[PDB]
Structures are given as C-alpha cells and as structure tokens.
Amino acid sequence: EGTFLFTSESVGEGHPDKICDQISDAVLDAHLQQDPDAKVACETVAKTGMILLAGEITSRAAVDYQKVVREAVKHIGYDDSSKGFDYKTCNVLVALEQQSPDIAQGVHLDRNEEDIGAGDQGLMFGYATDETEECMPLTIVLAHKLNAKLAELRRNGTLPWLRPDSKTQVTVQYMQDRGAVLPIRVHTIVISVQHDEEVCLDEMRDALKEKVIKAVVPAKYLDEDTIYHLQPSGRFVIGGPQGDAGLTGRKIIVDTYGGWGAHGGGAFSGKDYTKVDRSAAYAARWVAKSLVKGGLCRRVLVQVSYAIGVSHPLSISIFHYGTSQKSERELLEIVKKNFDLRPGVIVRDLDLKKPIYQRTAAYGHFGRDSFPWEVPKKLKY
Amino acid sequence: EGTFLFTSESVGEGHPDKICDQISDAVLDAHLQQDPDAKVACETVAKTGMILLAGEITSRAAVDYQKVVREAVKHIGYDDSSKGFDYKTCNVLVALEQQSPDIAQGVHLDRNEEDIGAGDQGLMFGYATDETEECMPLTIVLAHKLNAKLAELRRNGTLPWLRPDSKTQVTVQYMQDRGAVLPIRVHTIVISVQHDEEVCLDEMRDALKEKVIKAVVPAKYLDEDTIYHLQPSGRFVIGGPQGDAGLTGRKIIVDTYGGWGAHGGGAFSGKDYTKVDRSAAYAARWVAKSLVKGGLCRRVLVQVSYAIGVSHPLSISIFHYGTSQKSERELLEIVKKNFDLRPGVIVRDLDLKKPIYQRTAAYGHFGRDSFPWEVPKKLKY
Numbered sequence: 234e235g236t237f238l239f240t241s242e243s244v245g246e247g248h249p250d251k252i253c254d255q256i257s258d259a260v261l262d263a264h265l266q267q268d269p270d271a272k273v274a275c276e277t278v279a280k281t282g283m284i285l286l287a288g289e290i291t292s293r294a295a296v297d298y299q300k301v302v303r304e305a306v307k308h309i310g311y312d313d314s315s316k317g318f319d320y321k322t323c324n325v326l327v328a329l330e331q332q333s334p335d336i337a338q339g340v341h342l343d344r345n346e347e348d349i350g351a352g353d354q355g356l357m358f359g360y361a362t363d364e365t366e367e368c369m370p371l372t373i374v375l376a377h378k379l380n381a382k383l384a385e386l387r388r389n390g391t392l393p394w395l396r397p398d399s400k401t402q403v404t405v406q407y408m409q410d411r412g413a414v415l416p417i418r419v420h421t422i423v424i425s426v427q428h429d430e431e432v433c434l435d436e437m438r439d440a441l442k443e444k445v446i447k448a449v450v451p452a453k454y455l456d457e458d459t460i461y462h463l464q465p466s467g468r469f470v471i472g473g474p475q476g477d478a479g480l481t482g483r484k485i486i487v488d489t490y491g492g493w494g495a496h497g498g499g500a501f502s503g504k505d506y507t508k509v510d511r512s513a514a515y516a517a518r519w520v521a522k523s524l525v526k527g528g529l530c531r532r533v534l535v536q537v538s539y540a541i542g543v544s545h546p547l548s549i550s551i552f553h554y555g556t557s558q559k560s561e562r563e564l565l566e567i568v569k570k571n572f573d574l575r576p577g578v579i580v581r582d583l584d585l586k587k588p589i590y591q592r593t594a595a596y597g598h599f600g601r602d603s604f605p606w607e608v609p610k611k612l613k614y
Numbered sequence: 615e616g617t618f619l620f621t622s623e624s625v626g627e628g629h630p631d632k633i634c635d636q637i638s639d640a641v642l643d644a645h646l647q648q649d650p651d652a653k654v655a656c657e658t659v660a661k662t663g664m665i666l667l668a669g670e671i672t673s674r675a676a677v678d679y680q681k682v683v684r685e686a687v688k689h690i691g692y693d694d695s696s697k698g699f700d701y702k703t704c705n706v707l708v709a710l711e712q713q714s715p716d717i718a719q720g721v722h723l724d725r726n727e728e729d730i731g732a733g734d735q736g737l738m739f740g741y742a743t744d745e746t747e748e749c750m751p752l753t754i755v756l757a758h759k760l761n762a763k764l765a766e767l768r769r770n771g772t773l774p775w776l777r778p779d780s781k782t783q784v785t786v787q788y789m790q791d792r793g794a795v796l797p798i799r800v801h802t803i804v805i806s807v808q809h810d811e812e813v814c815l816d817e818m819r820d821a822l823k824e825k826v827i828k829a830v831v832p833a834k835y836l837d838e839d840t841i842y843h844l845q846p847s848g849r850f851v852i853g854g855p856q857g858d859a860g861l862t863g864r865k866i867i868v869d870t871y872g873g874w875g876a877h878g879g880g881a882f883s884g885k886d887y888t889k890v891d892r893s894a895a896y897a898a899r900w901v902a903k904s905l906v907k908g909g910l911c912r913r914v915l916v917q918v919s920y921a922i923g924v925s926h927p928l929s930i931s932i933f934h935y936g937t938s939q940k941s942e943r944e945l946l947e948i949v950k951k952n953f954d955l956r957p958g959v960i961v962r963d964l965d966l967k968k969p970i971y972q973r974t975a976a977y978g979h980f981g982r983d984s985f986p987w988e989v990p991k992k993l994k995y
C-alpha cells in the first residue's frame with residue numbers, strides 16, 4: 234500500500250538521436266570558442282551514411298563543419314563500416330542560413346545584454362528531488378549510469394563486441410513519503426545494445442548482468458523478483474543511424490528528469506543562451522536544486538514561461554508536493570528575491586557563453602559534473 | 615492563497631515543426647491506405663525550400679512521395695514564394711530505407727498479431743482532467759483554439775495578411791481543489807503569427823485581440839489585469855521553414871497535455887501502431903479518460919512502459935492526485951481487468967490501421983473529434 238512503480242530510460246552516446254544532440258552542441262561550442270555572442274540554432278539529422286546540419290547561425294566564427302562533425306562522430310566511436318557508420322567516410326551536408334533578421338531585430342539587436350528579449354516564447358520546468366545526493370530521480374540516474382558503463386567497457390576493450398548505440402530502462406518500486414518519494418527496489422531493467430556479428434546471445438546476456446548491471450546498481454535494490462530484459466530483441470547488429478534515423482531534440486525526457494517533474498517541450502542542444510528553451514530550463518533546475526539543498530523543500534517543481542522579445546518571464550510558479558513548511562506563495566517570494574530569470578542575466582550567473590555544451594549532450598543535462606546550474610545558490614530570506 | 619499560474623502553448627499548422635508532423639502522418643496514411651500492415655517510421659525535416667523524408671518504411675504500398683508531400687504543404691497554405699515556401703516549387707528529397715531486419719525479426723516477424731512485441735522500449739503517459747468537458751487542461755485547449763481561429767480567418771479571407779506559421783501561449787490562474795484544479799482567469803496571452811509585408815503592427819494587434827482572442831476565450835476569463843503580448847517580436851514576415859528549421863517530433867508537449875500530466879519523450883507522427891510511443895500513449899489517454907468519465911477520479915495520470923520485442927507492458931502505474939475514494943492500487947486492478955495494453959490488442963480496440971493520422975498532427979492528439987481513444991470505455995468493477 235502506498236507503493237507504485239515508475240520507469241525511466243536513457244540512451245548511449247551512439248544512439249542516433251543522441252549523436253545529433255552531440256553534433257549540434259559540438260557546432261555550438263565551435264562557434265562560441267571564436268564568437269561568445271554567436272546566435273546558433275543548429276539541428277542535426279542522421280541516417281545511413283549521412284549527417285545533415287540544418288538551421289540558423291549568425292556568428293563571426295569561421296567553423297569547419299566537416300571537421301567538427303567528423304570529430305564528434307569519431308569521439309562517439311563510429312569509425313568503420315563494419316559498425317554501420319564511419320566518421321572518415323560518411324556524407325556531411327550543410328543547410329545553414331543566417332538567423333532570420335526579423336527574429337534578430339525583435340530579440341537582441343540594439344538591446345542592452347541584460348535586457349535582451351527571450352529568443353522565443355515557451356514554457357520550461359526545473360525539478361529536484363532529495364531521493365539522491367545529486368537531487369535527481371533514481372530511475373534516470375541508474376539508467377544513465379548503465380549506458381555510461383557500456384561505453385566504458387567498450388572503450389576499455391573488455392567487451393569488444395559492443396558498439397556505440399544503446400538504450401536502457403529502469404523501473405523502480407517507490408514508496409510515497411509526505412510528498413517526497415523513497416526508492417525501495419529495482420523491479421525491471423532493460424538493456425539493448427548494438428553488437429558485432431560474432432558474439433552469441435547468451436554471452437551478451439551474461440555480460441550485461443554481471444559486468445554492467447552488477448557494476449552499476451547496488452545489490453540492495455536487486456532481488457530474486459527483479460525482471461531482466463537483456464537484448465530482448467534477440468539481435469541488434471544493425472544500429473546507429475543505419476538502424477534508425479536520429480534528430481536533434483528527440484530525447485528531451487532523457488535529457489531532463491526521466492518522466493518526473495514536467496517538461497515544456499523545448500530541446501536543449503544546438504542553441505545559444507538567448508534560446509530560453511535551454512537557458513531558462515537550466516536556470517529553473519538551478520532554482521529547484523537551490524530550494525532542495527537549502528532545506529526549504531524535499532521535492533519541487535518550478536515553471537517559467539516567456540514571450541519572444543520580452544526579457545522577464547511572463548509567469549513563475551512553484552509546486553512543492555507538500556514537502557515544505559512554507560507555502561508555495563512564500564517560496565515564490567524567496568525565488569523572486571534571489572533570482573533574476575531574464576536570459577541576459579542567466580547568461581552571467583550560469584556562464585552560458587562558455588563552450589561546454591557538448592559535455593551536456595549525453596547522460597543528461599542535470600545531476601552531473603557540478604555545471605553552474607548544479608551548484609546551489611545560497612538563499613537569503 | 616492556494617492559487618497558482620500555469621502556462622501552456624500551441625502552434626499552428628504552418629509552424630515548421632508541425633509541418634513536419636503533418637507530412638510524416640500524410641506519408642503514414644498514404645501507406646496505410648494501400649497496406650494496413652505497413653511498418654512506417656518517417657521523419658520529416660524542413661528548412662528553406664526543402665522537405666526531406668528520412669527513416670524506415672517496409673510496405674507493399676506504392677507511394678508517390680512527391681505528391682503526398684506537396685499536397686500536405688498545399689493544404690497547410692504554403693503556395694507562393696511571397697509566403698516563404700511553395701509546395702509547387704520546393705525541393706522534396708527522400709532518404710528512406712526498409713525497416714531494419716534486426717528490428718523486424720525481434721518485433722513482428724512470425725508473430726501472432728495479438729502477441730507482436732512492442733516496436734521499441736519506452737515509457738508513455740496518459741492524462742485526463744475534469745476541468746473541461748473534453749477532459750483536457752484549459753491552458754492547452756485555449757492555446758490550440760487560438761491557432762485554429764487564426765487558420766480559419768486566414769482561409770476565409772477576413773485577415774488576408776495572415777500566413778500559416780503561428781504560435782500561441784496561455785497562462786491561467788488556477789485554484790487547487792482536493793487534488794483537482796479549477797481555472798479562475800486568464801493571466802497572460804501571447805500570439806505570434808507570420809504576416810505580409812504591408813499590414814501594420816497596430817492593425818495586427820487590434821485584430822488579434824478583437825477577432826481572435828475575443829472569438830475564442832470566454833469574457834468571464836478576461837479582465838482589466840489580463841496581459842496581452844500580441845506580435846511581441848514586432849515583425850514576423852519571414853516565417854515557416856525559412857525562419858526556423860522544423861523536424862518531426864519537436865512539439866510533443868503541444869501534441870499532448872501542454873505541460874500537465876507527464877511525458878515519456880516519444881513522438882507520435884510518422885509511426886505505425888507497432889511503435890508504442892504512439893499506440894500506448896493513445897491507449898493510456900483512453901484509460902485516463904475512461905477513469906475520469908466513469909466517475910472514478912477527477913484527475914489521473916497513467917504510466918506504462920515496454921521493452922522492444924515484449925508484448926505486455928513492463929509496468930503500469932496510476933496516480934489520482936487524491937481525487938478518488940479508491941486507492942491507486944484499486945484503480946490499477948480496475949484498469950488491469952478492463953484493458954489489454956499489448957500493442958497487438960490496442961490496434962484492434964483503437965482501430966490503429968486506419969489512415970486517420972494526418973488529422974491528429976495539428977491542434978493536439980487528444981481532446982478532439984471523438985477519435986477512438988477519446989470515446990471512454992465502460993468499466994466493469
């Protein structure tokens with residue numbers, strides 16, 4: 234009684250949608266290295282033999298798109314036709330134009346940086362939960378770590394039949410606790426990973442349990458009843474873009490909270506700070522995490538929204554699930570007094586002209602690596 | 615006290631991401647008209663002068679992609695270079711391959727239809743709320759209707775300066791009510807719509823208030839304090855794919871609940887029923903709506919999840935926000951007794967081989983038109 238199941242998923246660095254996110258952010262970073270004020274809206278599409286860049290960039294940088302794209306694919310591990318994709322020999326097509334002058338004039342032309350308008354309308358959420366030290370849902374943390382473990386064992390050569398494309402999924406049984414949530418046990422794990430033509434199914438399934446799951450998931454969460462779906466399709470030799478087209482911004486729940494909290498729909502990768510889809514979502518995470526680490530809440534969801542061309546958010550809302558002694562109205566006043574959510578101020582607080590974005594584009598944007606939005610602000614109230 | 619703001623957005627038929635969703639589903643429908651068992655995973659990308667189809671289709675149909683794509687763009691209204699895009703003269707590129715044989719063998723080859731495996735892993739949610747008769751959040755309903763009104767007034771010639779690309783956003787002040795939510799008033803409305811070079815800003819803003827907002831939003835929700843951001847960028851002559859690249863599956867929150875409920879990350883358009891991202895999300899909506907219309911709950915969220923190749927969901931979970939006298943455990947038993955969420959049964963219950971998908975691809979997939987997933991099931995318990 235009072236228990237429920239909840240499932241989240243993650244994907245690996247060579248999952249075709251994630252390839253696109255990483256390439257889009259490699260392009261962003263390449264621009265920002267030369268022009269910190271570059272306006273970038275770079276979408277990537279991947280299919281057999283093809284990376285296409287489409288979108289809008291206005292920048293003083295001189296960027297070699299062939300080199301940037303191919304080096305990103307190399308880093309991911311697609312380096313031979315036997316793996317289904319090769320950075321050395323794939324097609325890289327570019328359909329990039331300047332940013333629309335109508336957008337530019339309405340957003341940032343002749344505006345003081347702090348008073349730049351939002352680059353679009355939209356809604357964004359931030360979420361934090363005390364169930365893990367990194368203030369993230371356990372389901373998504375574990376799912377990400379299973380993909381990272383696969384990449385580790387591929388790159389270190391101990392499971393050399395692995396290829397870069399993978400997906401994982403973790404179902405946890407939770408107990409509710411005064412609006413907070415408490416993980417009890419892992420109910421089901423799925424792992425699917427691209428593999429070579431020689432390794433057999435039983436070798437893979439044994440390795441995925443013993444060398445992947447047991448190396449990631451604490452034994453206290455695994456029991457005789459846990460269900461394992463390891464290579465459930467039976468065969469995954471064809472993978473990467475050859476198996477499934479990829480696009481930027483098609484893993485937005487993997488990028489965020491694994492189904493927990495809420496999402497406003499905007500993708501992160503390929504976008505400079507003036508695109509509030511990214512900057513305001515990062516700021517909202519920073520607010521949520523600051524509220525939890527500051528001891529005001531155990532679990533919290535923050536919504537913000539914007540209109541194109543308008544600097545201040547149109548709305549700010551907080552929901553604490555019953556996990557604060559303060560009302561949400563009081564928390565909102567605390568947030569108002571401690572944070573300025575104009576994009577031209579967020580950029581300063583979170584250092585969003587720095588070319589660190591490719592690092593955000595796999596394994597989730599939140600809960601990792603002490604990025605600026607992961608360092609709580611000390612709140613005055 | 616106890617009130618909060620919440621914002622949702624919608625986009626019009628000519629918004630570039632929505633163009634792609636509609637084209638992807640026009641392709642799906644064209645296949646299904648000839649081959650009800652077509653396996654379709656069609657992504658669309660749009661930029662200046664270009665529609666690209668990328669993905670995987672295995673089908674007995676003979677489909678003229680040039681005709682299907684161009685007729686969809688014609689229907690949307692992009693028929694002249696003066697509007698930034700023209701179905702008669704744009705480039706249509708095709709990068710479509712067969713479905714991966716490794717996927718096919720693990721999902722559906724040599725399987726009884728009722729026992730076909732899920733076409734992928736993933737998680738999906740369904741949501742319903744008694745705050746409107748269509749069991750949808752008021753924020754998203756109003757946002758969709760504002761876009762539909764723009765298209766109506768464009769197509770009937772009374773605002774002939776309108777073009778097909780639009781976005782809207784509605785912020786509502788709500789009161790919480792025993793786990794349910796009650797709309798009080800509209801706090802802020804945003805409308806941005808592409809327009810011709812001749813019309814002036816004041817004419818547009820006056821028309822958007824008097825002919826669009828007042829024709830859609832009941833006066834009881836609008837007051838002296840409501841904030842209007844109408845053409846907030848100041849100029850939106852460049853639009854459609856020329857202003858911003860579009861991709862399929864980049865409006866997944868517009869397609870669903872406007873930020874309410876939850877989302878598992880999967881896109882709907884371009885996918886046949888074996889892709890649980892669509893079929894299981896439709897079934898989960900059907901469950902949620904059945905629970906609310908059956909008087910068991912006022913508001914409910916349902917999660918399901920799958921593993922590729924496995925027919926039955928790996929998890930099913932229900933959360934009623936405190937709006938039922940029954941426990942969630944009891945509701946779960948009711949759902950288990952009344953629904954079979956295998957994809958090969960959902961297809962029968964919801965008639966998912968029928969070529970009605972292009973109709974779902976603008977103005978949201980839920981809350982409209984008495985699609986099968988919108989007709990509640992009578993529950994036995």
Ligand SMILES: O=c1cc(Nc2cc[nH]n2)[nH]c2c(-c3ccccc3)c(-c3ccccc3)nn12
Pocket residue numbers: 235236237238239409412413492493494495554875876915916917931932933934942943
């Ligand atoms: O706070 C609570 C307390 C609670 N108690 C019980 C008890 C039996 N079932 N549920 N269930 C939940 C859920 C949830 C559970 C299952 C399915 C869907 C949602 C969520 C939630 C998660 C993600 C996004 C939004 C909301 N929060 N949440």
Ligand SMILES: O=c1cc(Nc2cc[nH]n2)[nH]c2c(-c3ccccc3)c(-c3ccccc3)nn12
Pocket residue numbers: 494495534535536550551552553561562616617618619620790793794873874875876935
């Ligand atoms: O049931 C309640 C009761 C409630 N009461 C108050 C009172 C003051 N603030 N909130 N707020 C909420 C929210 C919510 C409100 C603002 C920001 C973010 C979420 C949601 C919700 C919406 C979408 C997705 C998931 C959850 N549900 N919900």
Ligand SMILES: C[S@@+](CC[C@H](N)C(=O)[O-])C[C@H]1O[C@@H](n2cnc3c(N)ncnc32)[C@H](O)[C@@H]1O
Pocket residue numbers: 248249250398399400425426466467468469470471472473476477478654655670671713714716717720733734735922
């Ligand atoms: C199953 S494919 C999506 C459906 C696909 N577009 C089709 O044509 O049926 C989605 C993701 O699952 C993974 N995948 C690809 N082939 C797979 C296989 N044979 N077995 C398991 N997972 C696979 C890859 O990560 C891929 O990006």
Ligand SMILES: C[S@@+](CC[C@H](N)C(=O)[O-])C[C@H]1O[C@@H](n2cnc3c(N)ncnc32)[C@H](O)[C@@H]1O
Pocket residue numbers: 273274289290332333335336339352353354541629630631779780781806807847848849850851852853854857858859
């Ligand atoms: C603002 S554009 C996104 C940012 C863009 N990719 C860039 O290069 O800055 C996103 C959407 O807003 C709308 N849009 C395009 N131009 C606009 C304008 N001048 N004013 C307001 N909205 C516009 C269109 O619906 C478009 O798909």
Ligand SMILES: [Cl-]
Pocket residue numbers: 250734
């Ligand atoms: Cl996927």
Ligand SMILES: [Cl-]
Pocket residue numbers: 353631
């Ligand atoms: Cl957009």
